[PDB]
């Protein structure tokens, strides 16, 4: 009849069970794999920086001179 | 191992990380451009402007 939350608070157990339905945890003991995630994010940032740079340059060069006036210069 | 060592080298400092991000973006864009240009030239053989049999015979 003891509340579940009260029993969980008053009984700190070493064996902790997570959901694990869509995220399979690493076995207890293996080191955290944070370098791999950071490098995946780094590749994504490579991609995002490329897109931002090309968009900015596209807008600037569109506002720049055009082929018609460039050719009329001779 | 390799990932951890590279993480140390290019992420000990955030400024170094940003510099590496910019350099990697530049290099990856260049490599992608090179690969796509090679694919385009391999696919479109004999149709390029330089491939026209007559160019100064007019």
């Amino acid at each position: 009849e003891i509340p579940a939350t009260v029993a969980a608070v008053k009984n700190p157990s070493s064996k902790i069970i997570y959901d694990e339905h869509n995220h399979e945890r690493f076995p207890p003991g293996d080191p955290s794999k944070r370098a791999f995630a950071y490098f995946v994010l780094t590749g994504g940032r490579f991609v995002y920086a490329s897109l931002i740079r090309l968009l900015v340059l596209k807008f600037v060069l569109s506002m720049s001179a055009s082929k018609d006036v460039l050719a009329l210069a001779s | 191992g390799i990932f951890e060592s590279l993480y140390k080298v290019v992420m000990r400092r955030n400024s170094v990380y940003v510099t590496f991000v910019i350099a990697g973006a530049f290099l990856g864009e260049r490599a992608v451009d090179y690969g796509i240009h090679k694919l385009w030239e391999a696919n479109n053989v004999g149709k390029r402007y330089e491939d026209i049999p007559v160019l100064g015979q007019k």
Binding site: A49 | T19, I22, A23, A25, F26
Partner: peptide, 24 residues
């Protein structure tokens, strides 16, 4: 920090050379 400021200046210069790309 002097070193931090220098590294951030290097990063900003690299970003500027990536954007403008003077003589690649």
């Amino acid at each position: 920090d002097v070193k931090a400021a220098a590294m951030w200046g290097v990063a900003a210069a690299t970003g500027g050379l990536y954007l403008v790309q003077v003589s690649i």
